[PDB]
Amino acid sequence: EEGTFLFTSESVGEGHPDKICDQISDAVLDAHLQQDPDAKVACETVAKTGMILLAGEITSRAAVDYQKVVREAVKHIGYDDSSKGFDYKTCNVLVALEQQSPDIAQGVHLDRNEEDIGAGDQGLMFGYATDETEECMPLTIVLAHKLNAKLAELRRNGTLPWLRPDSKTQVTVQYMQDRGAVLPIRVHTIVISVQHDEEVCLDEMRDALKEKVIKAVVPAKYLDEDTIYHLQPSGRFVIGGPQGDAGLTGRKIIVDTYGGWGAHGGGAFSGKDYTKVDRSAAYAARWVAKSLVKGGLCRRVLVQVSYAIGVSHPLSISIFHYGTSQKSERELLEIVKKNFDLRPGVIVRDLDLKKPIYQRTAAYGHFGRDSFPWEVPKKLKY
Amino acid sequence: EEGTFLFTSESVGEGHPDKICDQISDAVLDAHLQQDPDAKVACETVAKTGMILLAGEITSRAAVDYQKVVREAVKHIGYDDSSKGFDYKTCNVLVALEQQSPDIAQGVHLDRNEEDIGAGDQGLMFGYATDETEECMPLTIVLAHKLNAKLAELRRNGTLPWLRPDSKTQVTVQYMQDRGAVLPIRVHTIVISVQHDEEVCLDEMRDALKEKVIKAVVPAKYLDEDTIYHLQPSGRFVIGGPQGDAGLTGRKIIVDTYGGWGAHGGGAFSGKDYTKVDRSAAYAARWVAKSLVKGGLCRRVLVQVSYAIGVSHPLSISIFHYGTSQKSERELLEIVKKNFDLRPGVIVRDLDLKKPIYQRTAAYGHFGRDSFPWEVPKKLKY
Ligand SMILES: CC(C)n1ncc2c(C(=O)Nc3ccc4[nH]ncc4c3)cc(C3CC3)nc21
Ligand SMILES: CC(C)n1ncc2c(C(=O)Nc3ccc4[nH]ncc4c3)cc(C3CC3)nc21
Ligand SMILES: C[S@@+](CC[C@H](N)C(=O)[O-])C[C@H]1O[C@@H](n2cnc3c(N)ncnc32)[C@H](O)[C@@H]1O
Ligand SMILES: C[S@@+](CC[C@H](N)C(=O)[O-])C[C@H]1O[C@@H](n2cnc3c(N)ncnc32)[C@H](O)[C@@H]1O
Ligand SMILES: [Cl-]
Ligand SMILES: [Cl-]
Numbered sequence A, B: 001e002e003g004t005f006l007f008t009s010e011s012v013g014e015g016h017p018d019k020i021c022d023q024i025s026d027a028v029l030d031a032h033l034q035q036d037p038d039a040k041v042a043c044e045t046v047a048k049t050g051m052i053l054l055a056g057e058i059t060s061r062a063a064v065d066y067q068k069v070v071r072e073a074v075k076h077i078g079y080d081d082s083s084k085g086f087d088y089k090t091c092n093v094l095v096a097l098e099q100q101s102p103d104i105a106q107g108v109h110l111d112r113n114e115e116d117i118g119a120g121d122q123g124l125m126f127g128y129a130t131d132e133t134e135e136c137m138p139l140t141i142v143l144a145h146k147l148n149a150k151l152a153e154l155r156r157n158g159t160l161p162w163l164r165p166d167s168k169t170q171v172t173v174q175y176m177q178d179r180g181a182v183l184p185i186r187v188h189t190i191v192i193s194v195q196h197d198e199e200v201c202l203d204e205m206r207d208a209l210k211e212k213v214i215k216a217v218v219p220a221k222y223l224d225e226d227t228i229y230h231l232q233p234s235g236r237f238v239i240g241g242p243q244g245d246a247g248l249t250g251r252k253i254i255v256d257t258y259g260g261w262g263a264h265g266g267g268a269f270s271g272k273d274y275t276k277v278d279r280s281a282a283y284a285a286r287w288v289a290k291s292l293v294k295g296g297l298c299r300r301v302l303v304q305v306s307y308a309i310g311v312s313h314p315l316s317i318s319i320f321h322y323g324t325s326q327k328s329e330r331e332l333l334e335i336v337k338k339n340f341d342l343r344p345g346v347i348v349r350d351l352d353l354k355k356p357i358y359q360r361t362a363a364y365g366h367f368g369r370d371s372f373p374w375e376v377p378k379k380l381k382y
């Protein structure tokens, strides 16, 4: 039908090996921040059969038990037995952590007033908001996340005890073009792949994924007789987690953000303290975009910012409103400049980014949930 | 000025530790493909002080010397001495490689006709093309890549012998909005950070980066008295490569593609054979987008595709032409459907994706150079 298009987003579960690495990286960041709010943390995690490796740079006054922090994160995810392919009790935890490069430290934060700390790196970051949901997120990515959360819920409450922690979901929505905004019409296609035990048959799993997962998450008004279902499309997913697929921190950056909507500057979030603008500026850009939509200045908006290592102020700010504002992009840019200070040493104060809440961000997306500070819109003066 | 906006893209050099990992992952893929064109390769690389770790899944008839392949890639990059922070001769090479999950193999390619092989994973992928350059790439990302290539050239030819392999660049362009297309006006800001020896002073480096790098790359017509230069903005970059910052495969996915323009589905390219649609479908989507622009059907276009693991045909195809076509997005989608077969087992034939040319893709972006098969536009019938 004219003026309609498809858009697909994916999400992954807590036991997806890339997401394990994000959660462990952020468990390590939180452990540091609990003791040293000014910890400099750049913690990469690598997961493969029987192995968590931490690699990166931490300068911190904290005394952190990496064995305890890593194993507790893997326990939470649900990898607690060799039968599941991974066990927090018996896996290898390897550590290749060194202090932050003194050359970076001197260029970024040494002898700097906190408000005037340099960006911890160069880079570009985007924030996006869309009025298509109350939480100002694309429906595709919201539904994809909720399908993984539902799998974890039914695993944890024992109603589908054949479930394992590693899962992926994908949602295709047919959208109507509406004066620069997008109106969801229907769910065109759903994919669910989830790791499972060696007892449950494929028909039992496919029936349960439709009746107990999809129907429990996706409103019936979006599902019809044409909706395509790819449930356990590989046919067998017993081998999973790190054993099935090597995981790395920062390899789910589109799952972490807008499910392909908006834009992405390439930076990973997990394992990084606020001085790493890959995270703090992306959080602030989401906060700006959500403030513009919730302030009624536009229905859909994209914010780009960029930084140079050692420089506080963003090098560039850009606003793209998809034609969904009576105000020009120039007028929105002036409103953003009058209302926001996107220096990392000010963002840290506004969004409370020394607080050890980061592990809670590292699954089901960083945006659109739990009224994190970047999800509470700023009242705009103009 | 009205109808203008800023856009920023970044690039990194061959010695950037994330890019080292991409190049090593693709050196391993090429080594396998040279002996076994049907090698199943999912090779992640991790780099930190003194360490290359390979982690992932390879099923191959090839006999590959991982020590030789890794060290030769690091030699090519230029890390050949402890004075530079990393040495191919004396670094640790660790291998945590296992066969591909039999559960994946059976669901994707076992006993399948090559044309009908399943996608190696679910996911979404985008292709983008823009008429703003002959190679149909954004000027921001082209200039950012060329600045890193120029640093490597002047390092390798000995004219700036204080240069080390680790570099990052960032280019902000002021654009004019032109009937849905974008017209570059001027370069607003350039960042260059490059690793250097302990002899050269900051003023010598900043003078050389302006006169011998920027002026050798960026046309003077884009530079004016207002252009902002952030050259060695950290003030000191002696510690670099993996010693300065842990690197991972697939952590430069926006550098690898469009520098934040278009869109990204989240998939990494390097270390993956053609059955991994993260790479093959992103290459095919670029080929489609470039074919539409070079065919004169639009000035700027974005193509989304998506897949389910074990399913050959894409689940969804979407065309966004930014209002730069007389044809509707529906009419362009029909043209794409009539001219392209985006099954991975057909893409492999069209783009010759068993050929060991992947290491050549793993720096300076996968798109817009060297007339790779995905850069040669398909003549469209309609
Ligand atoms: C860059 C990517 C993430 N991105 N950003 C917007 C879109 C759209 C989109 O918004 N289309 C559209 C076109 C005309 C219209 N008039 N009113 C409303 C409206 C909407 C579509 C796609 C498909 C996936 C390629 N990607 C988009
Ligand atoms: C989703 C991101 C990568 N993305 N994709 C397009 C844009 C534009 C853009 O094309 N703007 C514009 C607006 C109106 C116009 N009329 N004619 C031409 C034209 C152009 C701008 C930004 C800034 C960085 C936020 N991002 C974009
Ligand atoms: C398909 S694997 C990626 C390709 C893999 N590295 C290989 O060697 O072919 C990517 C993700 O899909 C999921 N996965 C793993 N095994 C699977 C299977 N048998 N069926 C479906 N999805 C699976 C896991 O979430 C895993 O992290
Ligand atoms: C700034 S480092 C990332 C943050 C780092 N992990 C930390 O511990 O703070 C990111 C990239 O910037 C570059 N880099 C490293 N040291 C640098 C320095 N002293 N000055 C400028 N850029 C540097 C390298 O390309 C490196 O991979
Ligand atoms: Cl959720
Ligand atoms: Cl180049």
Ligand code: NA
Residues within 6 Å of the ligand: A245, A246, A247, B042, B044, B056
């Ligand atoms: Na992997």
Ligand code: NA
Residues within 6 Å of the ligand: A042, A044, A056, B245, B246, B247
């Ligand atoms: Na790193």
